[PDB]
Amino acid sequence: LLRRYLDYPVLWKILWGLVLGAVFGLIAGHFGYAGAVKTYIKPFGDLFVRLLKMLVMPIVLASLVVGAASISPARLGRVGVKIVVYYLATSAMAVFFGLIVGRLFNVGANVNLGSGTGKAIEAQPPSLVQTLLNIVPTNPFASLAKGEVLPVIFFAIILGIAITYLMNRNEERVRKSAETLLRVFDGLAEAMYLIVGGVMQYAPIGVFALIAYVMAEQGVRVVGPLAKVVGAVYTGLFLQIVITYFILLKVFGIDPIKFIRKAKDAMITAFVTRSSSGTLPVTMRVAEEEMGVDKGIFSFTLPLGATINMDGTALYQGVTVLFVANAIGHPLTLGQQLVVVLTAVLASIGTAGVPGAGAIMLAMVLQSVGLDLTPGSPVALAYAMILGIDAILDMGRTMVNVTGDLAGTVIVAKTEKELDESKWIS
Amino acid sequence: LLRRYLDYPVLWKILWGLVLGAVFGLIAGHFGYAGAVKTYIKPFGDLFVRLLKMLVMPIVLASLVVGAASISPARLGRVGVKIVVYYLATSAMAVFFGLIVGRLFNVGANVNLGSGTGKAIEAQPPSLVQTLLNIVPTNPFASLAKGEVLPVIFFAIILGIAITYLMNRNEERVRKSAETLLRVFDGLAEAMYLIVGGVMQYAPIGVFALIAYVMAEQGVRVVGPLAKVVGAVYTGLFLQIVITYFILLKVFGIDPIKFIRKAKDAMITAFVTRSSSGTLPVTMRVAEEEMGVDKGIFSFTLPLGATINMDGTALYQGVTVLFVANAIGHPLTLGQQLVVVLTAVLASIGTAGVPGAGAIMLAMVLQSVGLDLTPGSPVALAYAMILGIDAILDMGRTMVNVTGDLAGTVIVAKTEKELDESKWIS
Amino acid sequence: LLRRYLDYPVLWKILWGLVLGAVFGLIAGHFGYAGAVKTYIKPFGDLFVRLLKMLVMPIVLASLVVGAASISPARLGRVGVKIVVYYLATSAMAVFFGLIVGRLFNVGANVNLGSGTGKAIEAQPPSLVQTLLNIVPTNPFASLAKGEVLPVIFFAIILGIAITYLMNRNEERVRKSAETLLRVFDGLAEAMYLIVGGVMQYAPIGVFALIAYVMAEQGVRVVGPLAKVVGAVYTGLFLQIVITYFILLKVFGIDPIKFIRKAKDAMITAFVTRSSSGTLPVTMRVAEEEMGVDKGIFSFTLPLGATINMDGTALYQGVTVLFVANAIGHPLTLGQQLVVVLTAVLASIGTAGVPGAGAIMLAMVLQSVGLDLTPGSPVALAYAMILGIDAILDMGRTMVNVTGDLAGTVIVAKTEKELDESKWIS
C-alpha cells in the first residue's frame, strides 16, 4: 500500500498479479527454488485463501435472509423452482460433458503407476433421499459451525420467509421487531460485501503467491499426462460454456455473445480469485448495471446460486476421478463412473464456492468407493498430483460456476419479464 | 384443493394422522409391505423429525431471552416477585408430580420399542453437584452448537435479566442498544413461532409416516400405552389441583372448596376453548366479579400467568419424559429426573400457548436429558406417538393452567391483605 | 446481610477471599479435612470458574466489534491514526516488557502445582508462520464454537471496521442497517459488562473455594510466589515507564524528566482512586495547563486512551500469563508468546473498565494462548491465585494506564506542532 496500489483498477490489478506470478513460478521453479517459494511466498497465498473462506458462511446466511425477505413468497417460489431446474439441467449437461472429455483425451492413460488392479471397479451408494433430508438442519447453529452451506441456506430461506410474513402483521410491536431483525441481517450482508471488496485489494498478492507456488512446484508436471487433464478440464469447460449456456440463451431469447461481452467482468474476476462467494459483489454489480436484471431477483438468485452450482465441480470430478482410475490401472465403465452423481451432484451441492472445493470433494469420492489408504498406494500419488494442479483446475471450475450463475439469473429474469431490455440493445 | 387441509383444526388432524397411521401400519404389515413402507413412507417422518429439531435451539434461545426480559427482577415489584416465585415453585411441583405419576403408572412398559441388547453401560452417571454445575455453560456459542439446551437456557435467562437492568440506565446510547438487542431477540422468537406454525401444518403427514412405520415394522402395541399415558396425565391434573392448589390454599387460609366451586366458570371455559390466553378475559372477570381481587393485582398476575404459568404443560412433559424413557429401554435416574425438573420449568417462561409449546417443549426436554431425536431412533417413534396423542391431552391440560393462574392471583391478593373477604364468607 | 456483602469494594473483597482461603485451607490440611473441602467447598470454585469462562467469548466478540468500530480509518483523521498507532505500539512493547520481566524474575517457578511432566502432550506445535496464519478464521462461527479467541478477535475487528465504513455511506438503507447492527453489538457488550460485574461480585467465594482446596490438598507456597509476582509487576510498570516512555519522549524532543515531574497529579490521582475513567478530568487539566496541549488534541486523545490505552493491564497480562505457564509446569513457547502479545494488544481495543476487566482479559489471553481454563485443572488454581492478588496490582496499573495517555498526547501534540512550548522551555 502506498495509496496508489489501492486505486489501480481491481481487475487489472488481479490479472497483472496473476501473470507476474505465473512468470515468477516458471522462472524460479525452473532455477531450483521450489523451497524458497514454498517458504517465503506460499504463506501469502494461504492467507488469501483463508480470507476467502472467512466470508462465506456470514455472506451466505445474511444475504440469503435478505434476499428471501425482500421477495414476496410467491415470486420467491416462481424464481427458486426455476433456478433449481436450471442448475439441474446445466449440471446434468456438465456431468455428461465430464464423461465425454475425460475420454476424448484418454486422460491419465500412459501414466503407468505400477498398478493393474484396484478397488474402484464398482461402488455406487447414491443415497438420494438421505441427501434431500440432509438439507434440513437438525440444529441450525451446529450447521453454521460445521460449515455446511446447504442446511444454512435452507434455514436462512425459511427465516426470510418468516420475516416477510411478520412485517405484514398488525401488532406494531411485531412489525418493529421484524424490521429490526431484517436490518441486522441487512447490515451484516453489507458489512460482508465491504469486507469482500477489501479482500479483493489484497487479492493481487494472494493470486500472485498461489499461482507462483503452483507454477514453481508443478511447473514440470505439465509435461507428462497431467497436462492432458488440465487440457481435459479446460476443453470440457469451454464446451460447457459454448454449448450449454449459449444454447440456453438462444432458446430463451438472450443473445449469447452480448451476454459474454457483458459478463466478462464477473467471468474474469472469478476465473482468478477462484471463489464464487468472494466474487459475489462483482457478479451482483454486474447483474445490476451491465445485464439489467431487477434487484429483487439477483439479490437472491446470485447468492443462492453462488453456492448450489455444481457445473464446475461435476465437470471437474467427472474428469478427475477418471484420471485417478486410469492412473491406478483399474478401469471403470461409463455407468459405473457415475461416482460423480454420487458426490458432485448430491454430496457437493453446498461446497461449491470455496477455493479448492474440487480437490476435497475428490478426496471425499475416492474414499467412499473404497480407496482409502493415503500414504503409499498409487491412490496417494494419483491424487497428490491432482491436488498439485488443483489451482490451475480451480481457476476455471469457478469461472464456469459464475458464468452459469449469471446465465441462470438472466434466464429467471427474462422468463419473469424482470430483465431491463434497455441494456440488451447493441 | 389444499386450503381444506390447512384450515382444518390442527392438533385434531394430528390425531387423525396418528389413527390413520395405525390402521395403515396394520394393513401394510399384514399384507407384507414393511420394506416398502420403510423405504417410501418413512422419509416423510424423518423430514418431520428434522423439522421439529431445527426449531428447538433458536426458539429456546430467543423465547427465553424475551421471557426473562419480561419478568426479570429489575422490573418486578413486590407483587411481581411474589407471583413469579409462586409460578416457578408450582411448575416445579407440577413436574415432580408428573414424574411421580409416571413412575406410579409404568407408563411405557407395554411398548416393544428399542432394539434388543442395546447397551448396558448406561449407568455410572455424574454426581448431583456435577450435573448441577453443568448448568453454567463454559462457552455459550459452544453450547448452542453442541445442542445442549439447559446451558443455553441459563445463559439466555442471564442475558434477559442483564438487558432489563440495562434498559433502566440513564445513558440514552446504552438504553437504545439494550432495547434494540431485545427487539432482535423478539423478532427471532416471532419468526420461530411462525416456523413452528408451518411445521405443525406439516405434522399430519409426519406423524402419519412415523406411526405407519412403527406399526408396520413389527405390529407393536400402540393402544395399550397411549390409553395409559392419558389417564396418567388426567389423574395427574386432578392430583395437581386437589393436592397443590388445595394445600397451598389451606396453608394461606383460603378455603379451596369454595375456590373451585367459584372457579368452575374459567375451568370449563378453558377446558373447552383449549387456549392459555384465549380464555384470559373469562378467568380475569371471574377473578374480579367473584374472587374479589382488585384490578391492581389481577391485571398483572393473570396476564403474565397466561404466558409463564403452564403447570399443565409441566405435568404433561413430566409424564411423557417418563413414557419416552421407559419405552426406549432407558429408565431415568435422579440425575436426569432433575434435569427434566429444571428444563421443563425454566422453559415455561419460554411459551406462547399453542405455538410456543406445540409439543416443542417436550422435544426440548428430551434433548435436555440426552435422549436424542435422531431420525430413525426409538426416541423419535415414542415421541411421534405422544405428539399424535396431543389433542386428547391438550383439551384437558389447558384446564389446569388457568386454575393455576387463578390460585396464584388469589394467593397474592390474600398475602397482601387486599383480597376482600366479603366474597368468601357464607 | 447480603446488601452489605455487595457494596464492599470488589477487588479488596477478592483479596480478602484469597487470604481467608489460604488460612482456612492450611487449617483444614493440618486437621486432615482435605476430603471436606474437596467435596463441599470446591464445587463453588468449579462454579466460579465455569461462570467466568462463560463470558470470554461473548465479551471478546461484542466488545471487539464495538471498540474496533470506535477506532478505524473511516473516522480517524491524521491525529487519530497517529495516536492509535501509538497506543497499539505502546501496548505491544508493554506486553513484551511484561514477558521479559516475568521471565527475568522467574515468576511462579516454585508453586509446582502442575499434574507433572506431560498433561498437555502435543508433539508438533504450529510453526510461527502457521501461528500467524491461524489468526484469520476459515469459518468465524466455527471459531466461536471451538472457543478460539484470536480468530474471533480478528473477525470482530474486521467487522467493526466494515460497520463504520458503512455508517459513512450515503444510501439511507445501508446506513440505518449498519447503525442497527452496531447497536446490537453494543447492547450485547454492555449486557456482558453487567454480567461481569455480577460474576466478580460472586468471585470472592470462588477464590476462597479454589485457594482453600489448593492449600488444603497440599500446602503450596502462595505467600512467596505471589510476592514475586507483585514485585515483578511493579518492576515491570517502572521499567515500562523508564524505558518505553522515556525513550519515546526523548526521541521526539520532549524532556522526559520534566514530563514525569509535570504529570505527578494524574499519576497520583490514578494511584489513589484506582480508576482510569475517574481520573479523566484531572488528566485533561494536566494535559491542558501543565503540558500545553491545545483542546484540539487532548479532547480526542485522552477520552480515547482511557478506553483503549491499557499499558498497565497489558503488562499485568504479560507477567501473569507467564506466571500461569510457569506454575502449571508448562513453560510456554515462543509462538505462544507471540500469541500472547497479539491477543493482549488487540483485546485492549475492547477493554471495559468494570472492576475485573483485567481478570477477564487474563482469562481471555489464557484461552487464546492454549492454556485452557477448564475447572479442576491447575490453570484454574493458578488463575485464582492471580485474581486474588489482583487488588494489589490495581493501584499501580492505572498509574501506567494514565501515564501512557499523557505521553501519547504530548508526543502527538508535538508531532502536530500544537504543543504550547511556553510550558517546557526554561
Side-chain angles (χ1 to χ4, degrees), chain A residues 11 14-15 52 200 207 263-280 282-283 355 391 393-406:
Chain A
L11 202 170
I14 301 192
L15 270 295
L52 278 189
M200 285 317 163
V207 172
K264 158 163 49 57
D265 213 18
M267 289 171 65
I268 296 302
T269 302
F271 165 71
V272 286
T273 75
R274 76 181 44 74
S275 157
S276 303
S277 296
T279 189
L280 195 60
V282 168
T283 176
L393 306 188
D394 203 3
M395 284 198 317
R397 74 96 187 167
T398 175
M399 179 193 77
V400 64
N401 282 17
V402 161
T403 301
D405 285 17
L406 275 182

Side-chain angles (χ1 to χ4, degrees), chain B residues 244-260:
Chain B
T244 308
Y245 302 146
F246 276 46
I247 301 305
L248 265 292
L249 294 187
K250 181 263 289 180
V251 290
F252 286 174
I254 322 175
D255 282 8
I257 309 105
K258 44 185 65 180
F259 161 68
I260 288 296

Side-chain angles (χ1 to χ4, degrees), chain C residues 243-260:
Chain C
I243 303 197
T244 294
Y245 295 154
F246 276 31
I247 287 302
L248 288 181
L249 288 194
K250 195 168 50 190
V251 303
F252 277 66
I254 323 292
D255 189 61
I257 287 170
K258 48 187 49 187
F259 167 81
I260 287 309

Side-chain angles (χ1 to χ4, degrees), chain B residues 398-422:
Chain B
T398 299
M399 189 185 60
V400 77
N401 294 330
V402 300
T403 299
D405 268 352
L406 287 170
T409 288
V410 175
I411 275 173
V412 191
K414 166 65 66 178
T415 195
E416 280 216 329
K417 293 74 192 172
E418 188 277 330
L419 176 48
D420 54 355
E421 295 177 353
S422 171

